[PDB]
Amino acid sequence: EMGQGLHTKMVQVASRALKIPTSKIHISETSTNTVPNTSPTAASASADLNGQGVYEACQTILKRLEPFKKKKPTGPWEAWVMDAYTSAVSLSATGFYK
Amino acid sequence: ADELVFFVNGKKVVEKNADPETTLLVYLRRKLGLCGTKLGCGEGGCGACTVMISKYDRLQNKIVHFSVNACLAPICSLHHVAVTTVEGIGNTQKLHPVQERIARSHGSQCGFCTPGIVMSMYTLLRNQPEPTVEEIENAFQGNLCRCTGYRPILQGFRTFAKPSLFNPEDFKPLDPTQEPIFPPELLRLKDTPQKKLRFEGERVTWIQASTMEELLDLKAQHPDAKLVVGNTEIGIEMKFKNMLFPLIVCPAWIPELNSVVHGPEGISFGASCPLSLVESVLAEEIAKLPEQKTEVFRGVMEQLRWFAGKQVKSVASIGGNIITASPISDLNPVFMASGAKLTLVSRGTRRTVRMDHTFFPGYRKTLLRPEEILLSIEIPYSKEGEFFSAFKQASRREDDIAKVTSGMRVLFKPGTIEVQELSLCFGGMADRTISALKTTPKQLSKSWNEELLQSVCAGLAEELQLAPDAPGGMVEFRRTLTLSFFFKFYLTVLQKLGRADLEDMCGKLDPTFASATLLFQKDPPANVQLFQEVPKDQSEEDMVGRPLPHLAANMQASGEAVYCDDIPRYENELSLRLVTSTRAHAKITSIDTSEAKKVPGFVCFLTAEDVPNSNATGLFNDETVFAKDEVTCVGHIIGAVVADTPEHAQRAARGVKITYEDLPAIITIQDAINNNSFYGSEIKIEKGDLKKGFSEADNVVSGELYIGGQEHFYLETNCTIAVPKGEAGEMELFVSTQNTMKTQSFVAKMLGVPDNRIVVRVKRMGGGFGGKETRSTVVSTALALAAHKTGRPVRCMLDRDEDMLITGGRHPFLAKYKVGFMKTGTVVALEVAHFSNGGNTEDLSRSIMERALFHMDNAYKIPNIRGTGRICKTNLPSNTAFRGFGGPQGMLIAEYWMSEVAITCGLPAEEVRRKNMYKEGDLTHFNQKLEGFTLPRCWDECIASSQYLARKREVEKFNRENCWKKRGLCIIPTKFGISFTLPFLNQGGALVHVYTDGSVLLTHGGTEMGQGLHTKMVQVASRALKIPTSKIHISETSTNTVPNTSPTAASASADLNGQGVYEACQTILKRLEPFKKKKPTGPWEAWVMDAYTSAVSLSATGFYKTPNLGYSFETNSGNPFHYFSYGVACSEVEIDCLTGDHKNLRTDIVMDVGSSLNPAIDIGQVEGAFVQGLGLFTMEELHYSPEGSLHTRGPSTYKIPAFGSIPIEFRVSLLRDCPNKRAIYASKAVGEPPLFLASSIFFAIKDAIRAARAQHQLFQLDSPATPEKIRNACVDQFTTLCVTGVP
Amino acid sequence: CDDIPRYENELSLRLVTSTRAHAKITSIDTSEAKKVPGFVCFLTAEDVP
C-alpha cells in the first residue's frame, strides 16, 4: 500500500469471493515471510495480479466449507467456520496467479 | 568518592549514579544489554544468573576467580572487580570448549539454564584446568536444569577430567593461556590505597568502608547502619520480605575482617571471610594435621558440603551466617557445640564470648549490642579424646534448608570412656539454635555404653518437645531425627574409641551396624545410551533417525538465543505487575491505591472496570480476567499495576491495599467431598461383572493413596510483551506459551476485537511441560489490556514466587481402591474411586481425570473393573496440564495396589506383573485393541540388560549384611495412549516458502520449549524435499503464518506437525517435478529459479488430522488413542533407615519410540521426563497453610532434582526394529510416556522400607516418598520412643 | 516507518555521499567524525561481509 488503495480493493475482492462483509476481513501488512518471491508493486498491475491471487485463495476456503454450507444452508458463516474447525479442516490457503 | 568502576567482559564500566538496590543481573541485562545471564528465581538457588568475578587479592598478591549469583550481587559491592559473562568466553563464531561440549553432547534442551552451567564449568576450569569428576559434579551444586536429567551435561564435561550420541574426539582442545587477560588497569589501580565510597539511590545509601575505624565510627554514630557482606541473607530480606534498610555499610574490604590467624587453641577467621575461604583453609589443615586435632574442622567441612553451592559460598561470610541467627543455620549448631570463641568490637570496646545457648536470646537475635560488629570467630582444634560429628537432613542433599541440623561433641576424661563434657546442639527444633542442656549434664562421668545411649535418647525425646502445631510441621520426623543423629554419633564415637587402644574395652560395632557411620559419598557415574543405527544405504544428507544436536544448542550455550525478556525494550515500553488475593475466599470490600500513586513512574492500576469487552476468560469461560466482587483463591488476580520499571511496578503493587470479608473456603479434596463441590458429574469406565469378580477372588485388598501435586519449574517463568500498533485494534504479542491460538482468542475476546487483529509469536520457551498450555494467558491478557489502554508496549515477566503462586500445577489425587485376586497373583476384580484437586477454575481438569481413568489399568488386563473420577472445585490456584496429564497419577495407583497383590500372595513382584500384563490383540478396559504391542519385548530386554534376577540376590545379601541401610529394586512397565483426549485437537498445520536462492523458510503450529521439535521438523522437511537440513530454517511460531493451532502438548506435536510439514513439502515437490525431469541432475537451485521464472508458486500450506479417533464414555466404544507408547524401567535404591535420605544407584530403561526421528533428542526426552517423575514421586512437595496460602514459592523450599539426584548408573535403550507406520516416518511420540517409569524408584524405595521394617504387612507410603515419609515408615526404637513415649 | 517507536538500544545511520561526478577516492579521514558525541562507527566497502 502506497496510497493507491490496493488493500481496500483486495478486501472488496475477498468480500465478494467469500460472500461475507468487508468488516470481517483485515489486511495488516505485506511481508516476505507470508508471501514469498513477490513482484514489485508496479506496472499498474498489482490489483490485477494480487486480486486473482486473493480470489483463488478464497475459492479454496469456500471449497473446504462447501459440505458445512450444504448441511447448514442458512446458519451463519461463523457456524460453518467453527464446524470446519472442530471437524479438523484446514482454514488456511495460499493463492497464486500468473 | 562516588563513581563505581568495574569491568565487564574486559571493558571498563563507569557508573556515576550507582543505586545500592541495583543487582548485577539487572545491570547486565537492562543497562549493558547482555542478556545471556538469566533470571530463574532471584533467590540464589537456581544458578541461571551465574557469572564469574575476577579480582586482585591484596592479602595474597594474586589474581583470584570465583562464581557468583548475579541476582544477589549488589553492583555497589563490585568496585574494581572484573565480571565475565557467557558472552565474554565465546560466541557461535568461536565457541569456548565449555560451550561447544555442552551443546554437542546434548546437554542443552530449552537452553535457559545453559549460560549459568557454562559459567560454573568455566569458573571451575579457571581455578583447576584438570579437575576430577567429583570436582566437576560439585561445580553445579547451585545450578538447576529441569529438562535434561543432567546426565548429558556431566558426560560431556567428563572429557575435561584428569553408535554414539556424540564424538568427544572432534572436540576442540582447551588452551588455558587463551583466556581473557586480567584488566591491566586493575593491577595498576591496586597500587593506590582504597578510600571509602558512598552511593546514594532512590531509597538506600551504601557506604563501602575502607578501614575498621570507618566502620566502627559509622556504627557508633548510626547503629541502624546495616552491615552487608555477601548479601545472601539481606538480598532475600529486601526482595522477598519487603524489608528496607535505608543505610547499608559494606565492610568486605577491611583487612581485619578477612584475616586468617593460627593460634594455640585453633584458627581465627575474620567475620567477612567467605565460606569458600573457610573451606579451603580448613581442607589444608585437615590434610596436614593429625586426625585427633581436626574433629571440629571436619564437622564444619561436612556442613559446608551441603551448604548452598559454589556461587553462594564464594560471597556468603562466616560472620553473616552467625549474625543472621536463623533457626536452621547449619553452622551455628557446630559453633555452639564446639564453644567457638567470638570477638565482638565497637568503637572503644572489645570482648570475647564462647558461643553457647546464651548467645541467641530469641528469634533472629544475638547478644551483640547495636553498635558492635563481629570481628572474628576462632574454630577450635580438638583435643585428645574429644570427638565431633555434624549432621544435616533436608528435603534434598544439595542446596537445601535443614529440617534438623546438629553439632555434637564429647570430651572424655583422659585415658577413659567416661564423659567429661557432652554438647548436643540443634537447629530446626525451636525459633533459635539450641543446646540439649537438660539432657547432657546427666551424662557427665558415665561410660560411653548402651545405658548412656538409652539415657540420652529418653532425655532428647522429653526435652526436644514439639507441639503438634509446631511451626514447620513434620514433628515426628524432626524428633526422630534428633535421636537418629545422636545414635549415629554414639556409634561413630565407639569406632573412634576403638582406634585409640584404651586400657578398658569399649563396645565394638557388629559389622551390620558399620554402614550407619559412613559419611555420604557416591561412586562416579557409569552411563549407557543404546539406539539403532540408520540403514547403511541411507543418504548422508537424510538426517531422519540420526542424532542431530538441537538446532539452537550452540546459541543456547553462548547466551545468544533470545527468550522473551531478552528482547530489547522500546524506549516508550512500560512494566506491569499483577496484584493478587491474599485470601482463599472473600468479598473484596474496597481497594485503596493512594500509596501506589505516590511511587515514582506509576501509571495506572487496572481492574475489572478497565476491561473493554469481556471479563470472562479461561478454557471453560469460568474465570475472571480480573477479580470482580470476590476472590476465590490465594493468588487470584485482582488487578495490575503499570509503571515505568519493574522495580516501580513492584513498589506500587505493595501500595495497593485490599480490604476483604472472608467467605467459607473449600481447600482440600475432603472439604470438597463434604460440600459436594465438583466440576461437573462423575466420570466412569466399567467393564465386566464386579460382584462376580470379587466373590470369585481368593483375596481382597482395600486401601487409599494420596499423590501430591507438582510445580513445573520451567527455568523461564511466564512472560509476555504486548506491542499495540495504534491501528484498527492491531496488537502483536511476544509470549512464552505453548498455546498461541488460545492466547490470541483470549486477548481478542477481552478487548472485543476480531482474532484477525491479534498476532501471537513464539520463538522459544525456556521450558513449558504443560504449565504454559493455558495458564500463560492470565499474564498475556493483563499485559494486552495495559498495552491497549496506554497505547505503549508493555512487558511482564513473573518472578518465581508469583509464577508458582498464580499459575497452578499438577493435580493432587486421592484414590480409594479395592482389588480382588487369586493366590496365583492373577487380578480378577478392581474398583478405584479417584478425586483430584482442581482449584478455582475448570481449565483442563476434566480431561486430565479422563486420561487418569484411561490409564488405571497401566499394563494389566483386568476382566472386571470399575473406575470413577470426580474433580474437586476448591479455593486454590487452578491446576492444569503437567507432562503426563493424569496418566502418572492413574498409573501410580495401579502400581500401588499391584505391589500389595504381590506382597499378599508372597510371590515375586516381577512375576505377578508379567502374568497380569496384556498381550497383543487384547482390548483395554475402554475397549481399544492393543496392536503392535511391544511391551513384552521392552520388559524382556530390560530384565536381561538390568540383570534383574542377579541384582535381586545382591540386594537380598546387602540387606542381611546391613541393619541401618537397605536396598530395594523394582521393575515397572507402562502403556501410554498417544493423542489428545479431545479428538479435534489432533490436527496441525505448516507453511513453507522456497525463495529464489533455493533456501527454505518453514513454519508450523508447534512451539519449541526445549523438546527439539523444530530440529525434528527440519529433519523431516529435509528428507521430504531431498535437500540438506542446512538449506531449511525455522525462525518462529506465529498465528499469522499458521492459524487455529492446537497447543504444543499431548506429546503429539512432532506427529501432527511432521505430517503437516511433509504434505507442504509434497506440494512443492509436485510443482518442481516438470523442472526436475527437464534437468534431472541440475542442482536444486536451478529447479527453483526455473520454477520462479516460469511463474510457478513456491509457497504451500500443509495440514494433517489424526483419523478415526473418538471415544464415547456413554457406550465405552471408539478409540481415544492413535497408538500407545511402551517402556520399562528397573531401578535400585539404597535408603538410610536412620535419616530417610536415599541414593539412586542404578536405573535401566528400555523405551519404544518407534523408529526414532532423532535418537539424541528422544534419549534426552526419556532422561528428562524420567527425572521430572523422580521429582514427582520422591522429592517435590508443595505446602499450603490451613487457610489455602501456598507457602512453597521458590527453589529454597521446592526441591527439584539436582545434578546429585540422578541414578549413578543411568542406562537408556531405544527399542530396535519397531517401526510405527501410523506416525511420521514410523516414529512415536516420546515427551510424556517415560515420566511414569520413575515410579520404579518409588517402588524400589517401598521395597527397601519393607526390608527395614522386617529388620524391626501392607504399610502406607503416599507420594511423594520424601525423607520424612521414608524415615517415618522405618519404624524402630527411635520412632517408637518419639511417638508413643515407650522404649 | 519512522513513526515506529525506537528500541532503547537503537542507533541512527547517515549516508556519506560523493561530491564529485567521477573521481578516485585518494583517502578518507574520519578524525573529526570520531570526536562527535555518540559516534559509533563509519562503514565503508571494507565492512561489507
Ligand SMILES: Cc1cc2nc3c(=O)[nH]c(=O)nc-3n(C[C@H](O)[C@H](O)[C@H](O)COP(=O)(O)OP(=O)(O)OC[C@H]3O[C@@H](n4cnc5c(N)ncnc54)[C@H](O)[C@@H]3O)c2cc1C
Ligand atoms: C541459595 C542459598 C542457600 C543457602 N544455604 C544455606 C545453608 O545450607 N545453610 C545455612 O546455614 N545458610 C544458608 N544460606 C543463608 C546465607 O547464605 C548465610 O546465612 C550467609 O552465611 C550469610 O552471609 P552474608 O555474608 O551473605 O550475609 P549478609 O546477607 O551480607 O548479612 C547477614 C546478616 O549478618 C549481618 N552481618 C554480616 N557481617 C557482620 C558482622 N561482621 N558483624 C555483625 N553483623 C554482620 C548483616 O547485618 C545481616 O544482618 C543460604 C542462602 C542462599 C541464598
Ligand SMILES: O=c1[nH]c(=O)c2[nH]c(=O)[nH]c2[nH]1
Ligand atoms: O490428552 C491430552 N490432552 C492435553 O490437552 C494434554 N496436555 C498435555 O500436557 N498432555 C495432554 N494430553
Ligand code: FES
Ligand atoms: S536467578 Fe540467581 S540463582 Fe536463580
Ligand code: FES
Ligand atoms: S535445558 Fe536446562 S532448564 Fe531447560
